[PDB]
Amino acid sequence: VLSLSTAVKELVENSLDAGATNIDLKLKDYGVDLIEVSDNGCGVEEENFEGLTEALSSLCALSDVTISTCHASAKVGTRLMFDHNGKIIQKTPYPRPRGTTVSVQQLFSTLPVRHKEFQRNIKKEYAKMVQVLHAYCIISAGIRVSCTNQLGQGKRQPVVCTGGSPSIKENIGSVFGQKQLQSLIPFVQLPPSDSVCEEYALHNLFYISGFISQCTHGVGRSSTDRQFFFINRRPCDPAKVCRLVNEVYHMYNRHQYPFVVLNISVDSQEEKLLLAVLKTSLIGMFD
């Protein structure tokens, strides 16, 4: 849509919305040539093919979109080709398992300026997409998320793959290795302290979970390269929450920055209460 990372985000969310347990992201030239997301979700029924094309409509205007899909109620799958207006160029029977594969080829080709900027800044744009990819890998418990990349004429190479584990801890281990888990402690939520409450509580509905680096000297990280925040399992960047987490960690380890995976679960406001719970909990953890 706007970038490589947001295009991947939209396609992954669509696979998640379809109830997929396998989500495979296939890239060619870091996504400059091909962005392809394949899932084993519910698929699309024939009567809704034209209704596919909004994320998918915007992708059609900015790239060449091919979609293959097979609904559980269908006897055979279907392969669809779209023009830049979202109109179906052709639809043919296509033998494939249940699910949907969305192919985004030559993203931004219809906008030459954006296409050229995409290529020039591919290292930064790919790093943003990896961050989004890692966030979904960590939080999507029970879902096997994978990514592969193929550069030029070279062989296809695996980038990451999760094992469909029910715990965030194992998903973290799948993404970064077991060595990353050895320097982490689980988040332990505490009621806000009288002192911290004064610095800023009976109707507390915030539930915090996750992992953070130990405050022990040397155990931290050189930068904020691995900090993942979630509100109701949705990846996001809460500025005030992120600053508070790094501030409390620096109270005990000013030389380093922590690894962070924090999910904020709350009913469908009162952010000062959330910060008071976060600060009190982090102080009790690092003490």
Ligand X SMILES: Nc1ncnc2c1ncn2[C@@H]1O[C@H](COP(=O)(O)OP(=O)(O)OP(=O)(O)O)[C@@H](O)[C@H]1O
Q: Which residue ranges make up the site for ligand X (CB under 6 A)? A: 10, 13-15, 18, 39, 41-44, 52, 54-57, 100
100 binds Mg ion (CB under 5 A): no
Q: Is 24 annotated as a binding residue?
A: no
Measuring CA to CA, which residue among 282, 260, 262, 285 is closest to residue 176?
Answer: 260
Residue 114 or 221: which CB sits closer to its own copies? 221
Cα(63)–Cα(85) distance, integer angstroms:
10
Letter string b/e over residues 229-260, b meaning 16 or more CB atoms within 10 A of that residue's CB: bbeeeebeebeebbebbeebbeebbeebbbbb
In sequence order, the 6+-apart residues with CB closer than 8 A to the CB of 108 are 62, 63, 114, 115, 118
14 binds Mg ion (CB under 5 A): yes
Residue 217 or 233: which CB sits closer to ligand X? 233
For the bound state, the minimum distance from the C-beta of residue 164 to Mg ion, rounded and expressed in Å, comes to 22
55 binds Mg ion (CB under 5 A): yes
157 binds its own copies (CB under 8 A): yes
Burial class (CB in 10 A: 0-12, 13-18, 19+), 263: buried
Per-residue tokens: 208: 């915090």
For the bound state, the minimum distance from the C-beta of residue 41 to Mg ion, rounded and expressed in Å, comes to 12
Per-residue tokens: 82: 């779209």
* Bridging pattern class, strands 227-231 and 234-236: antiparallel
List the x/- string, 166-185, binding to its own copies by CB under 8 A.
x-------xxxxxx------
Residue 52 or 277: which CB sits closer to Mg ion? 52
Residue 4 or 277: which CB sits closer to Mg ion? 4
Burial class (CB in 10 A: 0-12, 13-18, 19+), 203: exposed
For the bound state, the minimum distance from the C-beta of residue 144 to ligand X, rounded and expressed in Å, comes to 14
Cα(182)–Cα(189) distance, integer angstroms:
21
146 binds its own copies (CB under 8 A): yes
For the bound state, the minimum distance from the C-beta of residue 102 to its own copies, rounded and expressed in Å, comes to 12
* Bridging pattern class, strands 144-150 and 157-161: antiparallel
From the list ligand X, its own copies, Mg ion, none, partner contacted by residue 235 (C-beta under 5 to 8 A by kind): none
Cα(119)–Cα(115) distance, integer angstroms:
6
Q: Is 20 annotated as a binding residue?
A: no
For the bound state, the minimum distance from the C-beta of residue 51 to ligand X, rounded and expressed in Å, comes to 7
Q: Is 14 annotated as a binding residue?
A: yes
- Which residues make up the interface to its own copies (CB under 8 A)? 21-22, 24, 26, 38, 40, 94-99, 101, 141-144, 146-148, 150, 152-166, 174-179
Provide the binding-site residues for Mg ion, judged by CB under 5 A: 14, 55
Give binding residues for ATP as ranges. 14, 39, 54-56
